[PDB]
Design an enzyme around this catalytic site. Structure first.
Site, short mmCIF file in Angstrom:
data_model
loop_
_atom_site.label_atom_id
_atom_site.label_comp_id
_atom_site.label_asym_id
_atom_site.label_seq_id
_atom_site.Cartn_x
_atom_site.Cartn_y
_atom_site.Cartn_z
N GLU A 88 0.85 -1.20 0.00
CA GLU A 88 0.00 0.00 0.00
C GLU A 88 0.88 1.25 0.00
O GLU A 88 1.97 1.25 0.59
CB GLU A 88 -0.94 -0.02 1.22
CG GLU A 88 -1.53 1.34 1.64
CD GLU A 88 -2.35 1.31 2.94
OE1 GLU A 88 -2.96 2.35 3.27
OE2 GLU A 88 -2.39 0.27 3.63
N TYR A 89 0.42 2.30 -0.68
CA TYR A 89 1.13 3.57 -0.71
C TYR A 89 0.75 4.41 0.50
O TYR A 89 -0.41 4.44 0.92
CB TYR A 89 0.83 4.31 -2.03
CG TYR A 89 1.37 5.73 -2.13
CD1 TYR A 89 2.71 6.00 -1.90
CD2 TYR A 89 0.53 6.79 -2.49
CE1 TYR A 89 3.21 7.30 -2.00
CE2 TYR A 89 1.02 8.09 -2.61
CZ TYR A 89 2.37 8.33 -2.36
OH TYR A 89 2.87 9.61 -2.46
N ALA A 90 1.74 5.07 1.10
CA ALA A 90 1.51 5.95 2.24
C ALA A 90 1.97 7.36 1.86
O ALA A 90 3.16 7.68 1.97
CB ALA A 90 2.24 5.45 3.47
N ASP A 133 9.54 -4.77 16.24
CA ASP A 133 10.40 -3.73 15.68
C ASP A 133 9.69 -2.38 15.58
O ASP A 133 9.79 -1.69 14.56
CB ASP A 133 10.92 -4.18 14.31
CG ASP A 133 12.20 -3.46 13.90
OD1 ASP A 133 12.95 -3.02 14.81
OD2 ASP A 133 12.45 -3.36 12.68
N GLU A 137 10.96 4.87 12.30
CA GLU A 137 11.30 4.45 10.94
C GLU A 137 10.30 3.49 10.33
O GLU A 137 10.01 3.57 9.13
CB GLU A 137 12.69 3.81 10.89
CG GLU A 137 13.84 4.78 11.04
CD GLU A 137 14.18 5.07 12.49
OE1 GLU A 137 13.34 4.81 13.39
OE2 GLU A 137 15.30 5.56 12.73
N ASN A 138 9.79 2.57 11.15
CA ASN A 138 8.84 1.55 10.69
C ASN A 138 7.38 2.01 10.72
O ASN A 138 6.45 1.20 10.59
CB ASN A 138 8.99 0.27 11.50
CG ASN A 138 10.36 -0.39 11.33
OD1 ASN A 138 11.14 -0.03 10.46
ND2 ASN A 138 10.63 -1.38 12.15
N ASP A 151 7.14 -2.77 7.87
CA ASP A 151 8.41 -3.40 8.16
C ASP A 151 8.24 -4.57 9.15
O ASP A 151 8.65 -4.49 10.31
CB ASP A 151 9.39 -2.35 8.68
CG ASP A 151 9.84 -1.38 7.60
OD1 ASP A 151 10.45 -1.82 6.61
OD2 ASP A 151 9.59 -0.17 7.75
C1 2JZ Z 1 8.24 -0.10 3.51
O1 2JZ Z 1 9.63 -0.29 3.24
C2 2JZ Z 1 10.24 0.94 3.40
C3 2JZ Z 1 9.61 1.98 4.06
C4 2JZ Z 1 10.27 3.19 4.20
C5 2JZ Z 1 11.55 3.36 3.70
N1 2JZ Z 1 12.24 4.57 3.84
C6 2JZ Z 1 11.74 5.82 3.49
N2 2JZ Z 1 12.59 6.84 3.63
C7 2JZ Z 1 12.14 8.06 3.29
N3 2JZ Z 1 13.00 9.16 3.42
C8 2JZ Z 1 14.34 8.70 3.79
C9 2JZ Z 1 14.63 9.11 5.23
C10 2JZ Z 1 15.44 8.05 5.91
C11 2JZ Z 1 16.80 7.98 5.69
C12 2JZ Z 1 17.55 7.00 6.32
C13 2JZ Z 1 16.95 6.09 7.17
C14 2JZ Z 1 15.59 6.15 7.40
C15 2JZ Z 1 14.84 7.13 6.77
F1 2JZ Z 1 13.52 7.18 7.00
N4 2JZ Z 1 10.91 8.28 2.83
C16 2JZ Z 1 10.11 7.21 2.72
N5 2JZ Z 1 8.81 7.46 2.24
C17 2JZ Z 1 7.81 6.52 1.98
C18 2JZ Z 1 6.55 6.99 1.67
C19 2JZ Z 1 5.52 6.12 1.39
C20 2JZ Z 1 5.70 4.75 1.41
N6 2JZ Z 1 4.67 3.93 1.14
C21 2JZ Z 1 4.92 2.62 1.18
C22 2JZ Z 1 6.15 2.07 1.47
C23 2JZ Z 1 7.19 2.93 1.75
C24 2JZ Z 1 6.96 4.29 1.72
C25 2JZ Z 1 8.00 5.15 2.00
N7 2JZ Z 1 10.49 5.96 3.04
C26 2JZ Z 1 12.17 2.31 3.06
C27 2JZ Z 1 11.52 1.10 2.91
O2 2JZ Z 1 12.12 0.03 2.27
C28 2JZ Z 1 13.40 0.44 1.80
#
Ligand code: 2JZ
Ligand code: 2JZ
EC number: 2.7.11.1
Lengths: 265, 36, 265, 36
Positions: A88-90, A133, A137-138, A151
């Protein structure tokens, strides 16, 4: 069987987030024009790190959970080199990013998140699932700014017995894990209080220069409150941050907590 | 996201020096099972 | 507490065997002049591969087992960078090496090993432990050429419920693992028959050019016997190599098997 | 010695294409638990 997912089913855009084994991309399914997050994991790297077992638990658990506060896993597929997760998109990104912009959250924002998460956790725990967890972040954000936990790689269906896997994240680790004891669903409640603290304060209660020191602090439940943290907030955190897991409240007690009801919206 | 926590390598296992020349504890499994 | 192990307690010699995370060295304890095997594992590499959890299971299980046919773990210690395991010495090396020298074993040698191992396994299973990684490589040899199982990294204390971890080694994997089903102590019996085959034949029954093909074969219990394999041997293997785990014999049935009693010494 | 077996990545999880516009299964946990 039936028609199965194919990479050719998705139009890909901007990377939403980077990770160790690959990224999440803004994705669209062609036939419906429906907006998704496609998570791309490389098998070589998962196997190198010895985490495919964790990847299986995520996929097998998350995909059978339905809650407006738990990010959906619509399904999965793989090719020779990668594994794809259709999530799902967030739209409003991570809670971690929100926290970084605001330095700390007010009581209303915190109590609302802690409700939405406590509901998601309540549902998990009813299906005998432990997330293990919980951390900014999660945690992701929906259209109306709703909290969505994701996550699920450290999660586990534990229907009968306690678990022994040392897992989670430094600042959020429960003491029973540090002291090398078996654990139960009460680990999600511990990290729920460490979350609540960090939400209100801007940093987590046992933060230190070394993992060694943090471990000592968590073991000793060694932490203090800043002056702005209200009696109500102080009560809840103190209850969740008990060293003895069985002394932590049930989630139902968190949902009905006077400070939660007086600030949640 | 996912991460691996550093272990402290303190195991429920013998670290005690032993005097080799020369010299009941497999109940450990039954006891560890009998925990409620 | 009491005096704890130190690296300075051991005089080191020849490396007995190389491994992925470090070697085993012929070791002597100074005060007694006693001969040991010191296994040296690097923390950086264990954590990189995500196997410290497996390392904990080995140490915590093996060290609480006592059997003349299970290699002893007298105890363990660690410094900043490494983990040391103080293991019993096995003068006659691995069974794998013996097999490589002889191409294949006669019936007397096989049935004797399969007794000694079935005894070791019988003891494990009585303590509710599953080894999960039976194979020539994980089998060592004592002073009088006695079989000693070791390498307990995939082992597990499973006192109540079945397990879900996909683990072991290609040719020795049970079908219930390949088909993604929960498993019990009956996996040690499956691999015990794959052992017995390889002992008598010189190669394992489902061996193929790809892991994909092997997986199909094990799933289908797809294997044949060469002409020299006796009716007695054929019976035992066929019984151990049942697709349905509950149709595999108990170890007590293996120990009392007519071909085992007629060849074991 | 110890080794990691290659997985076949066939999970008890949805691989079925779904028609997104538009359209009970959390019992999976109770059923998977109720296996004897
Ligand atoms: C679900 O798996 C993950 C979830 C999130 C992330 N990381 C992430 N990092 C950022 N900025 C980066 C800042 C940052 C930098 C270093 C560490 C942590 C951190 F947060 N923005 C986002 N935005 C979104 C927005 C909508 C979404 N909808 C659905 C799924 C994901 C989505 C992610 N996600 C990665 C994942 O897998 C790799
Ligand atoms: C317990 O942990 C290990 C056990 C055995 C080994 N490997 C090993 N390899 C060889 N030849 C190498 C052939 C070979 C080459 C490639 C693959 C496999 C293979 F077998 N010889 C031996 N001899 C002995 C003799 C007495 C022992 N007593 C106590 C403990 C170990 C002992 C090992 N061991 C390594 C381990 O950890 C790294």
């Amino acid at each position: 069987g039936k028609r199965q997912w194919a990479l050719e089913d998705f139009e890909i855009g901007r990377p939403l987030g980077k990770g160790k084994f690959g990224n999440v991309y803004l994705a669209r399914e062609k036939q419906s024009k429906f907006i998704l997050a496609l998570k791309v994991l490389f098998k070589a790297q998962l196997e190198k790190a010895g985490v495919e077992h964790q990847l299986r638990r995520e996929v097998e658990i998350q995909s059978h959970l339905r809650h407006p506060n738990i990010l959906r896993l619509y399904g999965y597929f793989h090719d020779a080199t990668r594994v794809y997760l259709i999530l799902e998109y967030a739209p409003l990104g991570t809670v971690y990013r929100e926290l970084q912009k605001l330095s700390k959250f007010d009581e209303q924002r915190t109590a609302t998140y802690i409700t939405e998460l406590a509901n998601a956790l309540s549902y998990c725990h009813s299906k005998r699932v432990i997330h293990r967890d919980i951390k900014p972040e999660n945690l992701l954000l929906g259209s109306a700014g709703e909290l969505k936990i994701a996550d699920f790689g450290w999660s586990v269906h534990a229907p009968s017995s306690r678990r022994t896997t040392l897992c989670g994240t430094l600042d959020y680790l429960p003491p029973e894990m540090i002291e090398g004891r078996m654990h139960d669903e009460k680990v999600d409640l511990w990290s729920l209080g460490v979350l609540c603290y960090e939400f209100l304060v801007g940093k987590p209660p046992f933060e230190a220069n070394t993992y060694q020191e943090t471990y000592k602090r968590i073991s000793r439940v060694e932490f203090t409150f800043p002056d702005f943290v209200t009696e109500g907030a102080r009560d809840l955190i103190s209850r969740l941050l008990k060293h003895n897991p069985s002394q932590r409240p049930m989630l139902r007690e968190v949902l009905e907590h006077p400070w939660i009801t007086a600030n949640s919206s | 996201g996912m991460s691996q926590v550093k272990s402290s390598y303190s195991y429920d296992a013998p670290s005690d020096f032993i005097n080799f020349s020369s010299l009941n504890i497999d109940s450990w499994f039954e006891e560890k099972a009998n925990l409620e």
